[PDB]
Amino acid sequence: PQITLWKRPLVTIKIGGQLKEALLDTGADDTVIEEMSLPGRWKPKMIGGIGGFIKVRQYDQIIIEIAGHKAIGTVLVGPTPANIIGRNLLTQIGATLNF
Amino acid sequence: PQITLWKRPLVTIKIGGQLKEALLDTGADDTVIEEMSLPGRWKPKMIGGIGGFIKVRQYDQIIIEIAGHKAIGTVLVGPTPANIIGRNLLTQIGATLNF
Numbered sequence: 621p622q623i624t625l626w627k628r629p630l631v632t633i634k635i636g637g638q639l640k641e642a643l644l645d646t647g648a649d650d651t652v653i654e655e656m657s658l659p660g661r662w663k664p665k666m667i668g669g670i671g672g673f674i675k676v677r678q679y680d681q682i683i684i685e686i687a688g689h690k691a692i693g694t695v696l697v698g699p700t701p702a703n704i705i706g707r708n709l710l711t712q713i714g715a716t717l718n719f
Numbered sequence: 720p721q722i723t724l725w726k727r728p729l730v731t732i733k734i735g736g737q738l739k740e741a742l743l744d745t746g747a748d749d750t751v752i753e754e755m756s757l758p759g760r761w762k763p764k765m766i767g768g769i770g771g772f773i774k775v776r777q778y779d780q781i782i783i784e785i786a787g788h789k790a791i792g793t794v795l796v797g798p799t800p801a802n803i804i805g806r807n808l809l810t811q812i813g814a815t816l817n818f
């Protein structure tokens with residue numbers, strides 16, 4: 621699809637067997653999801669943005685379905701105010717910015 | 720152009736006669752730039768990012784060149800770790816997200 625940016629670029633994702641809404645976010649290096657459990661091992665990480673840093677759990681090799689496209693990669697889980705699909709997974713579905 | 724996301728989508732902007740680098744950020748509603756001087760009056764605004772809320776200065780109707788395209792609109796100035804071009808100006812330059 622092609623998505624204009626008049627509104628937030630929100631899509632449905634499936635992660636951990638759960639359906640969620642998430643922002644397609646070219647300004648995010650990493651994918652960050654609101655608190656939930658994921659299978660497997662994880663390691664702690666700090667990520668920063670406007671407002672400062674938050675502590676997250678880093679899970680590797682997690683599959684997400686992004687608007688019907690499967691991707692695999694690292695997912696950060698923590699007290700983010702929004703679910704964010706970052707560039708590490710956007711590349712996997714071939715997303716580009718065009719102007 | 721068409722910009723893939725394997726690297727940060729950084730472009731050159733020109734604002735107040737100064738060249739700067741900024742991130743094209745579909746996850747940002749607003750354009751937020753690092754502290755600098757701008758003409759005119761400003762108004763208060765609070766924005767919420769990943770680490771919490773910050774106060775910024777809202778300057779309206781500021782002329783800003785983005786990757787060679789002219790935009791005129793609202794610019795927020797505050798302690799951001801990076802200059803970010805948000806949807807308010809991405810729509811002016813006609814950007815879309817495609818996959």
Ligand SMILES: COc1ccc(S(=O)(=O)N(C[C@H]2CCC(=O)N2)C[C@@H](O)[C@H](Cc2ccccc2)NC(=O)O[C@@H]2C[C@@H]3CCO[C@@H]3C2)cc1
Pocket residue numbers: 645646647648649650651652667668669670701702704706742744745746747748749751766767768769770800801803805
């Ligand atoms: C390490 O991987 C990550 C690191 C930081 C972030 S982030 O959420 O902090 N952010 C990073 C951006 C902003 C600073 C920078 O250099 N890149 C991604 C952003 O798209 C973020 C994503 C975001 C974070 C929190 C809430 C909503 C979206 N949006 C954002 O800060 O927008 C600001 C806050 C205001 C809310 C929406 O628009 C307004 C302007 C995401 C992944």
Ligand SMILES: [Cl-]
Pocket residue numbers: 655656657
């Ligand atoms: Cl859960």
Ligand SMILES: [Cl-]
Pocket residue numbers: 666667668669
């Ligand atoms: Cl970070």
Ligand SMILES: [Cl-]
Pocket residue numbers: 673674675699
């Ligand atoms: Cl935290």
Ligand SMILES: [Cl-]
Pocket residue numbers: 692693694708709
């Ligand atoms: Cl990854």
Ligand SMILES: [Cl-]
Pocket residue numbers: 714723
């Ligand atoms: Cl590619």
Ligand SMILES: [Cl-]
Pocket residue numbers: 729730731732785786787
């Ligand atoms: Cl450029």
Ligand SMILES: [Cl-]
Pocket residue numbers: 738739740741802
């Ligand atoms: Cl700069």
Ligand SMILES: [Cl-]
Pocket residue numbers: 772773774
């Ligand atoms: Cl502040």
Ligand code: NA
Pocket residue numbers: 659660661679680681682
């Ligand atoms: Na894992």
